[PDB]
Design an enzyme around this catalytic site. Structure first.
Site, PDB file in Angstrom:
ATOM      1  N   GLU B 264       0.601  -1.325  -0.086  1.00 42.33           N
ATOM      2  CA  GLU B 264      -0.152   0.019  -0.096  1.00 42.33           C
ATOM      3  C   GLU B 264       0.763   1.228   0.134  1.00 42.33           C
ATOM      4  OE1 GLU B 264      -1.952  -0.437   3.840  1.00 42.33           O
ATOM      5  OE2 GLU B 264      -0.548   0.964   4.590  1.00 42.33           O
ATOM      6  N   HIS B 296      -6.048   2.396   6.534  1.00 40.89           N
ATOM      7  CA  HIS B 296      -5.046   2.332   7.361  1.00 40.89           C
ATOM      8  C   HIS B 296      -5.336   3.270   8.724  1.00 40.89           C
ATOM      9  CE1 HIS B 296      -0.624   1.136   8.327  1.00 40.89           C
ATOM     10  NE2 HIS B 296      -1.032   1.889   9.570  1.00 40.89           N
TER      11      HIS B 296
END
Ligand code: CL
Ligand code: CL
Lengths: 331, 331
Positions: B264, B296
C-alpha cells in the site's frame, strides 16, 4: 399431541427437527407456506397450531380452526396482535407467544450499529470508493471508552445493550420510568434532561407505551448534543420520524441507525422490489445518506431462531397437556 | 530547547497548544507544510524537529539540519523508516519515535469491523437498496457470545482487542510465540492449529517480522473453518493477498476487513483520485464485494492523535534536556 407449523423458514427447519428429536411422540408437521382461507383444510386433525404470520388470516380460517377443535395457537414471536383474539376466544382456542428470544442479539446489534456510526464506516467507504485514502478530520473518530452512551429503557434488552457498551469501555447512563437494581451493574440512572444533553450516543430500548410514544421528537432532539448519534432497535413509534429527518438534514444528529420505522407494517418483512413505498416519510428514511436503515433484524440471530422455535413448541405442547404455561395469553 | 513542528494537521494543532500550555518556556513553533529543500532555512535556530511526513526529504535538507546543529528528529509515528537514518547518524542527530498511540483505538476498530462482518452489514444494505426487506438466511447472524474469536499476536494491541471481544461475550483464544500473563485475563492461549481450525473470527495483531510474513496463506486458510471471518488491523504483509482473494472468491472465507495491504505504500495516506492504482492485486482488493477495505485508519481516533503529539514532544524535549529517552532509536 398433533401440531402443525406454518410459515416455516429455512433457518427454522433444523431447529424444529432438533426439537422433534428431543420430544418423541409429538407429531409436528411443517409447511413453509402461510395459513390462509385457500389451504385452511390443512388444519384438519391437529390440536396445536404454531405460526409466525403477519399476513392476516381470514375470519373463515379461524372458523375452520373452531370446526377442527383446534386447542391452541402458538406464535413464535413476542407480538400477537396480528392474530384475531376475538375469534380465538369465541372458538375456545388458547393463545401463547414467545416473550423473549435473545436480548443479547438486540443489544449486540445496537453496539454494532453504534460503532458503524462512531467509527465513520459509511463516510470511510465513500472516500475509499473515490480512492481518497487520506487521514482526514471528517473520518477521525472518538473511542467509545471516551464517550457517554445513553440507554433509554432498562428492561432486559436495554440492560443487554448497557452491558455491551460498558464492556467496550463506555460510560453508560440510563433513564427508565421504573429504575431497577440489576441495571445499575452497567449504568447510572440519570434524568431525561441529563441523558439527552450529555450523551454522545443514544440507544433506544423502550417498549411501546403511551409514555414512550414519540419520546424522541423535535423538542427532545433539540436538547441533544450537536453531532449526537442515535440508534433505534426498539419499535419505531418511539421516534417522531419527520423530526428525526429534519434533524439529520440540518446536521443536529450526525447519524442514526434505525432498525424500525413507526409505520413499517405494509413493508416488513417483505420483498418490495415491485411494491412501491407509498409512505413518503418511510421512503425518505430508508434512502437517507445519514441513516443506516435495516429491516427489523436486530433480533435476527441463530440463538433467537432457536429460542423462537423451541419456546413456541414448548408452549404449544404445554397447553395441549393441560399444564400451566407462563407464555399463555389469557383471552 | 527550541523545537519546530512540521506537517501539522488540523486535528493535531489543539494538542500541540495543550502541550505548550503545560510546558511554558519551551519554544514550539509550528508549520502545516512539509519540510523540503525549498524551505530548509526554516530549520535555523531549532534544536528539535518534530515530524510526521509522507514525502521524502532531499539529502540537502538533512545536511542543512547538520549545519544548523539540530540535535534530534522526533517522529509522531511508530514507523521511522521514511526518514534518512544514514544522514541523521552522519550528522550526529538523534532519532525518537512514538511506539504506541492508543491500543484501544485499534482493538475497537477490530471489534467494529468484526461486527460489520458477523452482523452482515453490507449484505443487509444491499438487500435494503433493492427494497428486499425479508428475514432471509443470507443475513442471519451468529452472536459473538456464541463464537470463538482468535487473536493472532498478544502484544498491547492484541490484548486490547481480546479485552473488547471478551467484553461483548466472545470466547477468546490467542496464539503468540511468547505468551504473556496479562493477556490471560481476556483469552486462553492455544496452538496455532487450534486457533486456525476453531475460530469463527480471526483478528491479526502480529508485528511485521520474518516469522509473521504471509502467516495467512493458502495453507493456513485451508485450515480455517468454512465461512470464517478475517480482520487485519496489523500490517498487510501478514497476509498473502492473492491467497485471501482466491479464498474469498471460492467462499471459503465469508468476508474480510482489511485496514492494510502489503504494498500500500505508494497510496497511503494519499488522495489517489488522480493517481491510478496500477497494482492489480490492490485494485481488486479495494473493490472486492467481500472485503471491507479501509485506508489504515484503525488508529485514527482523538486519543491516538493526542498521544502522538504529546509523546513526540515529550521524547523530543527529554532528549534535548540530556535525559534518557525510552523512545530513542539508537542509530
Ligand atoms: Cl478518542
Ligand atoms: Cl447466535
Amino acid at each position: 399431541m398433533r401440531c402443525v407449523v406454518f410459515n416455516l423458514r429455512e433457518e427454522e427447519a433444523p431447529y424444529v427437527e432438533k426439537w422433534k428429536q428431543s420430544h418423541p411422540g409429538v407429531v409436528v408437521d411443517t409447511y413453509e407456506e402461510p395459513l390462509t382461507a385457500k389451504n385452511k383444510e390443512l388444519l384438519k386433525g391437529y390440536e396445536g397450531l404454531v405460526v409466525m404470520q403477519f399476513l392476516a388470516m381470514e375470519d373463515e380460517v379461524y372458523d375452520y380452526m373452531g370446526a377442527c377443535k383446534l386447542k391452541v395457537l402458538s406464535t413464535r414471536t413476542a407480538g400477537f396482535d396480528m392474530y384475531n383474539a376475538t375469534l380465538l376466544k369465541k372458538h375456545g382456542i388458547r393463545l401463547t407467544n414467545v416473550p423473549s428470544y435473545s436480548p443479547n442479539a438486540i443489544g449486540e446489534y445496537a453496539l454494532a450499529a453504534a460503532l458503524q456510526l462512531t467509527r465513520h464506516a459509511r463516510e470511510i467507504e465513500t472516500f475509499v470508493r473515490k480512492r481518497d485514502f487520506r487521514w482526514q478530520k471528517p473520518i477521525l473518530s472518538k473511542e467509545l471508552r471516551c464517550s457517554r452512551v445513553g440507554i433509554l429503557g432498562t428492561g432486559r434488552i436495554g440492560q443487554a445493550a448497557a452491558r455491551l457498551f460498558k464492556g467496550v469501555g463506555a460510560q453508560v447512563v440510563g433513564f427508565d420510568p421504573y429504575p431497577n437494581d440489576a441495571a445499575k451493574e452497567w449504568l447510572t440512572y440519570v434524568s431525561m434532561d441529563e441523558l439527552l444533553s450529555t450523551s454522545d450516543v443514544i440507544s433506544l430500548h423502550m417498549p411501546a407505551t403511551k409514555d414512550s410514544h414519540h419520546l424522541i421528537n423535535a423538542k427532545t432532539i433539540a436538547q441533544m448534543k450537536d453531532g449526537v448519534y442515535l440508534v433505534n432497535t426498539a419499535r419505531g413509534a418511539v421516534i417522531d420520524s419527520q423530526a428525526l429527518l429534519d434533524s439529520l438534514d440540518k446536521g443536529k444528529i450526525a447519524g442514526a441507525a434505525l432498525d424500525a420505522y413507526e409505520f413499517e407494517g405494509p413493508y416488513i418483512p417483505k420483498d418490495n422490489g415491485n411494491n412501491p413505498i407509498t409512505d413518503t416519510v418511510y421512503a425518505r428514511l430508508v434512502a437517507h445518506e445519514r441513516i443506516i436503515y435495516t429491516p427489523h433484524i436486530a433480533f435476527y440471530t441463530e440463538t433467537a431462531i432457536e429460542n423462537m422455535v423451541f419456546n413456541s413448541l414448548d408452549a404449544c405442547t404445554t397447553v395441549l397437556r393441560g399444564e400451566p404455561c407462563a407464555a399463555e395469553i389469557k383471552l
